[PDB]
């Protein structure tokens, strides 16, 4: 698996900014948003990996993702 | 192929480009490009050659002779160009022309007939010869028939006709090898008439 950071497409980031009420979207916001999302995923998925390794499980459940989001003050409901 | 090929105003065709799909039309009419109608009328007015010396004595003899006699005195002349034109396909085409298609002789003979059909009134018309043609058209208008000059005109003026075609040949935009072929079959014509001195 290589070049998967480009899976988050440019109109996907455009629609995400449209949900946030952004009037105009620059052409350099896409790489920065991809980097921010990569950093956030590299934190949350790593925390979920530690949670799964603690429980002697080989696949990561949604509850561990919920715990990893909750421990950083970003708690998620519905899972 | 290419980048600009449209029967209507071009829009980098390689269908109305830059428009929705509900505007197509493929009916058949006349087509004109006009460079997108002069670029939509400058954007709505900014938002609002001679014959060889072989038998050249004939026109010298006949230049003085047509001043008072005009080489003909009988209006229903017995000499017609039809038989002498028909004999070209049986005498010289079967002998001198290289084996193949005789189009270069027959098509030219038909074109000469078509030219002689309407060459009257504009050229080859001496003053009393013009009066004779006027009286021929007067006597031919009593039965509302077209004037057909194949039976009332001799072949003596054909030599003068092939003498006076080359300077009006170059009067129009024309390639030089066509004139070369013209003078080549003129040379063939004078070769054929070099020894056939009785009819001319």
């Amino acid at each position: 698996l290589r070049d998967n950071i480009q899976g988050i497409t440019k109109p996907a980031i455009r629609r995400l900014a449209r949900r946030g009420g952004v009037k105009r979207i620059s052409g350099l916001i896409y790489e920065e948003t991809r980097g921010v999302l990569k950093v956030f995923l590299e934190n949350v998925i790593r925390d979920a990996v530690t949670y799964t390794e603690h429980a002697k499980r080989k696949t990561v459940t949604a509850m561990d993702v919920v715990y990893a989001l909750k421990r950083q003050g970003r708690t998620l409901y519905g899972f | 192929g290419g980048r600009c090929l449209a029967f209507h105003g071009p829009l980098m065709y390689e269908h109305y480009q830059g428009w929705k799909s509900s505007w197509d039309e493929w009916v058949g009419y006349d087509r004109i490009r006009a460079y997108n109608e002069e670029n939509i009328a400058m954007k709505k007015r900014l938002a609002n050659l001679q014959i060889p010396i072989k038998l050249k004595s004939v026109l010298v003899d006949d230049w003085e002779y047509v001043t008072k006699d005009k080489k003909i005195c009988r209006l229903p002349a017995d000499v017609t160009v039809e038989m002498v034109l028909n004999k070209y396909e049986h005498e010289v085409s079967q002998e001198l022309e290289s084996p193949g298609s005789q189009s270069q002789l027959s098509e030219y003979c038909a074109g000469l007939k078509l030219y002689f059909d309407k060459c009257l009134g504009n050229m080859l018309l001496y003053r009393l010869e013009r009066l004779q043609y006027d009286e021929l058209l007067k006597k031919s208008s009593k039965d509302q028939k077209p004037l057909v000059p194949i039976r009332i005109y001799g072949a003596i003026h054909l030599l003068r006709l092939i003498s006076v075609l080359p300077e009006l040949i170059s009067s129009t935009t024309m390639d030089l090898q066509s004139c070369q072929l013209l003078i080549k079959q003129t040379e063939d014509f004078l070769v054929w008439l070099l020894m056939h001195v009785d009819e001319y």
Binding site: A12, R19, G21, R24, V49, E53, K58, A62 | -
Partner: protein
């Protein structure tokens, strides 16, 4: 290895952007596609530990959490853009928002 190698509509910018803002702000469905985000998640996870799997619901929760976080970040970025007398966002506004947030 062995190889040698009539007039169009012409909507002005901003109005359709506000139309999309109104359409997606009242909307509910997920903007980011499923499999590209899942493949990015697997590619990120393979750097930490190999032979790892994610369930569908875990990928769903990660996608919704990331979408909400990025929507909040874009809201802060747009607020900084209007705060800077602008309507176009810049990556330096995103960096400033991340610095203020402490992350």
């Amino acid at each position: 290895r062995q190889s040698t190698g009539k007039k169009p509509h012409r909507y002005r910018p901003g109005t359709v952007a506000l139309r999309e803002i109104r359409r997606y702000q009242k909307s509910t469905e997920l903007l980011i596609r499923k499999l590209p985000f899942q493949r990015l998640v697997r590619e990120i996870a393979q750097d930490f530990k190999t032979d790892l799997r994610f369930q569908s619901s875990a990928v769903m929760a990660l996608q919704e959490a990331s979408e909400a976080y990025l929507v909040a970040l874009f809201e802060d970025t747009n607020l900084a853009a209007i705060h800077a007398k602008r309507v176009t966002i810049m990556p330096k506004d995103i960096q400033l928002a991340r610095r203020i947030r402490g992350e």
